[PDB]
Amino acid sequence: KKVVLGKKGDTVELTCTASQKKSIQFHWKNSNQIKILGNQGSFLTKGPSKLNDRADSRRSLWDQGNFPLIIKNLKIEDSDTYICEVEDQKEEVQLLVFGLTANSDTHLLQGQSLTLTLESPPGSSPSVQCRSPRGKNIQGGKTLSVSQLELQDSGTWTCTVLQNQKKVEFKIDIVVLAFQKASSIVYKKEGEQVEFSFPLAFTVEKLTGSGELWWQAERASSSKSWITFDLKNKEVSVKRVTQDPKLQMGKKLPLHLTLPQALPQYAGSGNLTLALEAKTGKLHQEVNLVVMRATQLQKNLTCEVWGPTSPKLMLSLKLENKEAKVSKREKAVWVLNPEAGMWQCLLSDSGQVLLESNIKVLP
């Protein structure tokens, strides 16, 4: 009742051993008495089975009393019981051949699904467990499906098939393209020339990609504001659009959404959607910009932080020398009546300083 598990397209070696270390008559048959292979003296014979072109022995072991059935390029339909007849005795082995394929041979996107399908012989009911590089585990029988892939799922998945207390292992390479950042965030001040950056992971491929960035300026519901770009290899180019501010873009693959001067109205969220192909999908990665404006009215001052600020942060204005001239939790604080000193406006949260903008007072 011996059981051997094979992999589709692999080779297997089914063993037969005589009592004595000498070459004797042996023959391999299947469960329907179809001759696979045997010897005639020292010679190999092959029977009229469907295995004929893929069956062999190792004749260098026959003088050792070993008469193996080697089957290459295993097919699912090679699953059968095989019998070696040697010295008036029968040695029985059940071969079960499995195959395991991803439903996609092409690179996948983050958030897209992955489905593995186990090819199995009639009358077998195996369990399957597969594990991604990140440790994601999926279990099943015929089909195993992960709803949403993570970037960290890219690489070699290891799948174990369990059948008859035996197991066999499949390694499947999964390739997906994903952004290397979720919410990028830049804290600048009325003036500071803003830069943004969203990287990928090299790739080639033909006619392949273009999308655009969308922005929700703070208060200025005046949306539909954007920039459109087409890509091909290490070549990028603005399809058209931009307008509104002077956003400049690069000619080179490592995308740099440039914002000439960080003016106050350019604060808010944004989604940079990328979508290429062969068998498309669309990447996304968030973008956000905050601005701080430290400016003394007349003999009295004020400063304010626009954009995506947290209801957890604080703002403060002091003349650096001495401590807190005004501390608070909001985006538009004021300090009426300042004294000479190179004042610092401070935006943070918890403790670590986020935005810092210096400015002096006169008398």
Q: What three-state secondary structure class fits 99? A: strand
User: Among 259, 235, 229, 228, which Cα is nearest to 245's?
Assistant: 259
Whether 175 and 127 map to the same domain: the answer is: yes
- Specify whether 112 is located in the same domain as 175: yes
Cβ-based neighbours of 120, under 8 Å, separated by 6 or more? 76, 96, 98, 99, 126, 142
| Measured CA angle at 76 (ends 71, 80), to 5 deg | 70
Closest CA to 93 of 5, 2, 157: 2
> Which amino acid is residue 355, in one-letter code?
L
Judgement on whether residues 174 and 250 belong to the same structural domain of the protein: no
Residue after which a domain boundary falls, among 241, 263, 291: 291
Is the domain of 287 the same as that of 307? no
Dihedral sign from CA coordinates of 65, 71, 76, 82? negative
Same domain (yes/no): 309, 274:
no
Please tell me whether residues 287 and 192 are part of one structural domain.
yes
In whole angstroms, how far apart are CA 290 and each of 189, 208, 309?
8, 33, 7
CB 16 within 8 A of CB 66: yes
Q: Is 31 exposed, middle or buried (0-12, 13-18, 19+ CB in 10 A)?
A: exposed
169/130 Cα distance (integer angstroms): 9
Query: Collapsing DSSP states into helix, strand and coil, what is residue 59?
Result: helix
Q: Give me the resolution in angstroms, 1 decimal.
A: 6.8
Domains contained in the chain, number:
4
Cβ-based burial of 193 (10 A; exposed 0-12, middle 13-18, buried ≥19): exposed
CATH of the domain at 75: 2.60.40.10
Asked whether residue 327 falls in the same domain as residue 271, the answer is no
Our CA dihedral for 56, 62, 66, 67, rounded to 10 degrees, sits at 30
Claim to verify: residue 13 and residue 88 sit in the same structural domain: yes
Query: Would you state the structure tokens that stand for residue 247, as one six-digit string?
Result: 């956003």
89 plus 6 within the same structural domain: yes
- Judge contact between 148 and 111, C-beta under 8 A: yes
Task: Identify the domain containing residue 207 by its residue range.
Answer: 181-291
Q: Please identify, among 147, 180, 213, the residue that sits at the C-terminal boundary of a domain.
A: 180
Nearest-10 Cα torsion for 177, 180, 181, 184: -120
Q: 139 and 127 in one domain?
A: yes
Technique of determination: cryo-EM
- Residue with token string 């072991």: 61
CB-based contact 162:131 (threshold 8 Å): no
- The whole-angstrom separation of Cα 74 and Cα 171 is 17
* 273 and 233, same domain (yes or no): yes
Statement to judge: residues 27 and 94 lie in one domain? yes
Q: Which two tokens stand for residue 64?
A: 């050792």
Q: Which two tokens stand for residue 174?
A: 């999964």
Tell me how far apart the alpha carbons of residues 86 and 172 are, in angstroms, rounded to a whole number: 40
Distance CA 94, CA 186 (A): 64
Domain boundary among 155, 180, 205: 180
Task: For 271-287, give one letter per residue: b (16+ CB within 10 A) or e.
Answer: ebebebeeeebebbbeb
Looking at residue 226, its amino acid is W
Bridge partners for 333 per DSSP: 303
d(CA 141, CA 138): 10
